[PDB]
Structure formats: structure tokens, C-alpha cells
Amino acid sequence: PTYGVGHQPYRVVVLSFELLHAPATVCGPKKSTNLVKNKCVNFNFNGLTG
Amino acid sequence: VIRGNEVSQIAPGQTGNIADYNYKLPDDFTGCVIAWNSNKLDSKPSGNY
Amino acid sequence: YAWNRKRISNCVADYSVIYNFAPFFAFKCYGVSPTKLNDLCFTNVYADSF
DSSP: OOSOTTSSOEEEEEEEOOOSSSOOOOOOSOOOOOOOOSSOOOOEETTEEO | OBOSTTSTTSSTTOOSSHHHHTOOOOTTOOEEEEEEEOTTTSOOTTOOO | OOOEEEEEOSSOOOOSSHHHHSOOSOOOOSSSOTTSTTTSOOSOEEEEEO
16 A cells, blocks of 8 residues: 555456447347337437437 | 556557456457556555465 | 756667556657557667656
8 A cells, every 4th residue: 555556456347348240138228119110200229320 | 456557558459568468458449448446445554465 | 947867878778667667657658659669769868857
């Protein structure tokens, strides 16, 4: 504990993400909506907006 | 757990001691690094070994 | 106001031992990068201390 701040211990956690290649398993608390067709709508499929 | 001088080595495209011999990140890394000081929990007055 | 200049020449420069000597965070450089200094090499080095 008498060392300087450059020599002090640091706890590091690294989170690594696989963007979209597999079916999505880690998706946040955003709720879903019923699927409509043959109409011009905004869509959001697993973070793919359009 | 690393030292304070080696936090800058946890980055894509970075080299050093930790980056070459302990933990290497890819150049196309997509993710988040979190680092915080732990001098109260991971240290001892006789020296944590 | 009376900062000290030291000339460094005619020696092998190892920049990986600077981290052991002083407890700083970053080896902040402008024209070069801190991780490449062992590869390229220069004419004269100058140390200013204040």
C-alpha cells in the first residue's frame, strides 16, 4: 500500500462480444411487438433497424 | 489483476510484456474493458505475493 | 524557471525500464509511440526535469 499509484494493483474485466453470426442469445430488456406484413413500417430485428 | 502501468497495454494493436506474454487482444476487437483500483483488497503491508 | 537539461548520447537506450523507475500512468508521446521506441533509433536524447 505504500507504493505509488502507477504500481498499485488494478482489477480488470474485459467483455468480448460476438456481433451477429449465430442465433442471438444475449438480448436486452427491450420488449417485442406483433409482426405486421404488407405495410411500410419501421422494423427492429435483433438490433437490425430499418 | 495487473499493475497500473499495464492498463494501457489492454488494447487492440498494443504490445508490451502483458500483451505479448500474458493476454493478447485481437486487432478487430469489439468489446469493453473495465479497470478499477484495488489497493484496499489486493494488497498487504508485507507484500501480496 | 531553472529546469535541468541533460544530454543523452553514445549508449543503448532501453525504454522498458522507465516504468519500473517512476510510478506514472501513461508514457505520453507526440511524434512517436511508446511501444515502438526500441526499434527505431535517434541521434541525441534530451531530458528536461522540473
